[PDB]
Amino acid sequence: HMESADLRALAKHLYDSYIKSFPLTKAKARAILTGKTTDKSPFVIYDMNSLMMGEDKIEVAIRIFQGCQFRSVEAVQEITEYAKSIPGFVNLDLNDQVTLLKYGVHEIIYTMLASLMNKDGVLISEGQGFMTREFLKSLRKPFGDFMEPKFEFAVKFNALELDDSDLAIFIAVIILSGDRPGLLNVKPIEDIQDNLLQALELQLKLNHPESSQLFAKLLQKMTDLRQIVTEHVQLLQVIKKTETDMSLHPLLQEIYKDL
Amino acid sequence: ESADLRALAKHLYDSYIKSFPLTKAKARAILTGKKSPFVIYDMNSLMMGEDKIKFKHITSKEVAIRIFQGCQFRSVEAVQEITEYAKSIPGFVNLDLNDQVTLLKYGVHEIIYTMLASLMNKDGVLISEGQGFMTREFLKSLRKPFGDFMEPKFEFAVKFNALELDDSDLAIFIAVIILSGDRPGLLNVKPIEDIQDNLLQALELQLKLNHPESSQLFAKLLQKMTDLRQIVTEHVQLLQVIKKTETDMSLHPLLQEIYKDLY
Ligand SMILES: O=C(O)c1ccc(-c2nn(C(=O)c3c(Cl)cccc3C(F)(F)F)c3ccc(Cl)cc23)c(OC[C@@H]2CCCCO2)c1
Ligand SMILES: O=C(O)c1ccc(-c2nn(C(=O)c3c(Cl)cccc3C(F)(F)F)c3ccc(Cl)cc23)c(OC[C@@H]2CCCCO2)c1
């Protein structure tokens, strides 16, 4: 369908655009998380007092929640800019562009959040901070149990040991899903996705030649993504009905209309 | 090792034919009008069909309940067919016995949905090994939540059948589903993923040889595992509403026990 050199060219194009779109790459995140580096060392928030100190240096459960919301809105912006660089995307019907982004952003946010995580916590404020998993999970009300499922996913996803060049193509595959509800013209979407899938396949064989059927294992993760986004939506709805005082950025609000 | 992957595909195809009563190939010949099946399209024809053909399930006198229970009864039969097929998958019987049970327990729903599509088109479903055809409009027009319980199955089947898999494809796909290393409570995940890797390799080659013009069909088929997980989840929630709502669902406790897995 497509030839090797063109598939490599498409992989390079997507990697380059992923670097331009997203300020904190997996490579930077891992350097910070593993360290042995004096200049990139994060301030660690593990309890109430350190949270207070962290805000000098850089209700609690609400404030943290709103922090997640703020970064997710920024992430939607970053993902939207990346999507525009995917060959063919901006040429699609405009309603279909909206639909693809609407249903894809959440799955991509979860994917890319994993890059910022290990089993003990998450990088924040462009890598300047690290908030512990124990602290997040111990938050009160339903807020604790709202944070933990993200770590549970990230630990499993990070076991695949993808790098940024891999993720660039994977994220593109997610966006160009022809099975989203209400798509008007499925065919041109599937045509682009076939190219991306071919590109992802070759990328993974060259970049992880010892890792048998990594292509398939990675596509199987799209299943974990769909499920957790569904749980997420239902958890958020219970939170809104309990906490009629906090609200959501209009953009996220619109994304959640009809889930 | 191509030859070994072909050997594995043939082994699975042969066993899938022995295990399952009606193949996709036979079902499609019946569905496309290629000894017509008895057609159930309303209440009167249902009555005649069970009087003359004797569709097993029949014994609540209320039709919508009886059809619903019929789905459950056939699904229980399917569990035993799937269990027998699983034993023919190389490596499966050597797994820890608790893990065999776990894999089957959490896989059977996804497999039943998959294989149900083989028996469906946009207009209805074959029953009793293809001796009967019950229309989609009849099923969907059943009252209360029963109609809306039937329709999602057709909605899935129509999309899945667009891939135009044949039995030799499906034999490997079903095996891939069974050998899922992410099932809850698995004790020894490694040998499960090892077998699945072999099956995935076998499925990949099968699809390239059998459908060489069908680009990235391997990937499209794995993406259907997403539709499968989602609809099984919906299914569970639909079942739960029915149990809490319906007072006339009662069967002999022993029948109830037999079906506990699917209610
Ligand atoms: O820097 C980033 O790239 C980033 C991305 C996501 C979160 C984050 N979102 N979130 C959500 O619950 C969430 C998600 Cl996954 C998707 C869409 C919308 C939301 C929303 F928050 F609106 F509801 C999280 C839940 C838990 C955790 Cl640990 C993180 C997220 C992100 O987090 C920012 C940090 C988290 C700790 C407190 C300071 O902000 C960053
Ligand atoms: O011959 C077969 O291979 C076969 C397989 C499945 C059904 C059937 N199950 N079902 C379910 O709701 C279902 C499913 Cl999809 C998966 C797991 C468990 C269940 C359960 F029934 F337990 F709850 C159906 C729903 C609708 C329809 Cl149209 C069919 C199924 C099957 O059905 C046999 C027919 C259905 C109509 C009445 C006579 O039996 C056959």
Task: Give the Cα separation of B187 and B196 in Å (integer).
Answer: 16
Which residue is listed with tokens 């049970």? B101
Distance of alpha carbon B219 from alpha carbon B208, whole angstroms: 11
- Closest to A248 in 3D by CA, of A29, A2, A62, A3: A62
Q: Are strands B132-135 and B124-127 parallel, antiparallel or unpaired?
A: antiparallel
User: For residue A158, which of A200, A199, A114 has the smallest C-alpha distance?
Assistant: A114
Four-CA torsion B116, B111, B243, B64, nearest 10 degrees: 10
* Nearest by Cα to B168 from B29, B25, B32: B25
Residues B85, B174: contact at Cβ < 8 Å? yes
Q: Which residues contact A247 (CB under 8 A, 6 or more apart)?
A: A253
Helix (H/G/I), strand (E/B), else coil: B34: coil
Tokens in use for A172? Answer: 């593109």
Distance of CA B186 from the midpoint of ligand 2 (Å): 27
* Helix H or strand E encompassing B135: strand B132-135
> How far is the C-alpha of A189 from the C-alpha of A176, rounded, in Å?
6
Location of structure tokens 């997420």 = A232
Task: Determine the angle formed by the axes of helices B63-87 and B167-178, rounding to 10 degrees.
Answer: 80
Length of chain A: 259
| CA separation for the pair A141, A243 (Å, rounded) | 10
Between the alpha carbon of residue A166 and those of residues A18, A28, A175, A196, B215, the distances in Å are 10, 15, 15, 11, 21
**Ligand with the closest atom to the CA of B153:** 2
The CA-to-CA distance between both ends of chain B, in Å, stands at 44
Element at B125 (helix H, strand E)? strand B124-127
Q: How far apart are CA B202 and CA B204, in angstroms?
A: 5
For A52, phi then psi, to 5°, come to: -60, -40
* Whole-number Å distance between alpha carbons of A162 and A26: 9
**What CATH number has the domain spanning B1-263?**
1.10.565.10
How far is the first Cα of chain A from the last one, in angstroms, to the nearest whole number?
A: 36
How far is residue A232's CA from residue A259's CA, in Å, rounded to a whole number? 10
Q: Collect contacts of B257-263 with beta carbons under 8 A, ≥24 apart.
A: B258/B76, B259/B72, B259/B73, B259/B76, B261/B76, B261/B79, B261/B105, B261/B108, B262/B72, B262/B75, B262/B76, B262/B79, B263/B72, B263/B239
Resolution, angstroms, 1 dp? 2.0
Q: What is the DSSP string of B51-103?
A: HHT--TT-----HHHHHHHHHHHHHHHHHHHHHHHHHTSTTGGGS-HHHHHHH
Using left for φ > 0, alpha for ψ between -120 and 50, and beta otherwise, residue A121 falls in: left
Residue A67, token pair as written in the block: 């922090």
Residues with CB under 6 A from ligand 2: B 67, 70-72, 74-75, 78, 109, 112-113, 115-116, 119, 125, 127, 134, 139, 150, 153, 262
Dihedral in degrees, nearest 10, Cα atoms B234, B236, B241, B243: 160
Experimental method: X-ray
Residue B260 gets which letter from DSSP? G
Per the structure block, which two tokens stand in for B164?
């135009």
Give the closest-approach CA distance of A23 to chain B in angstroms: 30
Could you identify the residue written with the tokens 């949905």? B113
Burial A112-124 (b: 16+ CB within 10 A, else e): bbbbbbbeebbbb
Kindly report the CATH number that applies to the domain delimited by A3-259: 1.10.565.10
Breaks following residues of chain B (C-to-N distance > 2.5 Å): 34, 59
Is residue A126 within 8 Å of A70, Cβ to Cβ? Answer: no
Compute, in degrees rounded to 10, the torsion defined by CA atoms A12, A15, A17, A23.
Answer: -150
CA distance B159 to chain A (A): 10
d(CA B199, CA B176): 6
| Amino acid letter, residue B191 | P
Beta pairing partners, A122? A117, A131
Please tell me the distance from the alpha carbon of residue B79 to that of residue B112, in angstroms, as a whole number: 8
- Residue B12's closest CA among B120, B158, B168, B226? B168
Could you tell me the two tokens for B161? 């059948």
Contacts of B222 in chain A (CB under 8 A): 216, 219-220
Other beta carbons within 10 angstroms of residue B111's beta carbon come to 23
Binding-site annotation, residues of A: 69-72, 106, 232, 256
Whether B163 contacts B217, CB under 8 Å: yes
Which positions in chain A touch B159 (Cβ < 8 Å)? 179
Q: Does A219 touch chain B (CB under 8 A)?
A: yes
Say whether B2 counts as a known binding-site residue.
no
Contacts of A230 in chain B (CB under 8 A): 230, 233
Q: How many CB atoms lie within 10 A of CB B50?
A: 17
Q: Closest Cα partner for B76 from B261, B234, B242?
A: B261
Rounded CA-CA distance B173/B171 in Å is 6
- Distance CA(A216)–CA(B181), nearest Å, equals 13
- Partners of residue A43 on adjacent β-strands: A129
**Local structure of residue B132 (DSSP, 8 states):** E
Domains of chain A, residue spans: 3-259
Length in residues, chain B: 263
Three-state SS across chain A? CCCHHHHHHHHHHHHHHHHHHCCCCHHHHHHHHHCCCCCCCCEEECCHHHHHHHHHHCCHHHHHHHHHHHHHHHHHHHHHHHHHHCCCHHHCCHHHHHHHHHHHHHHHHHHHHHCCEECCEEEECCCCEEEEHHHHHHCCCCHHHHHHHHHHHHHHHHCCCCCHHHHHHHHHHHHCCCCCCCCCCHHHHHHHHHHHHHHHHHHHHHHCCCCCCHHHHHHHHHHHHHHHHHHHHHHHHHHHHHCCCCCCCHHHHHHHCCC
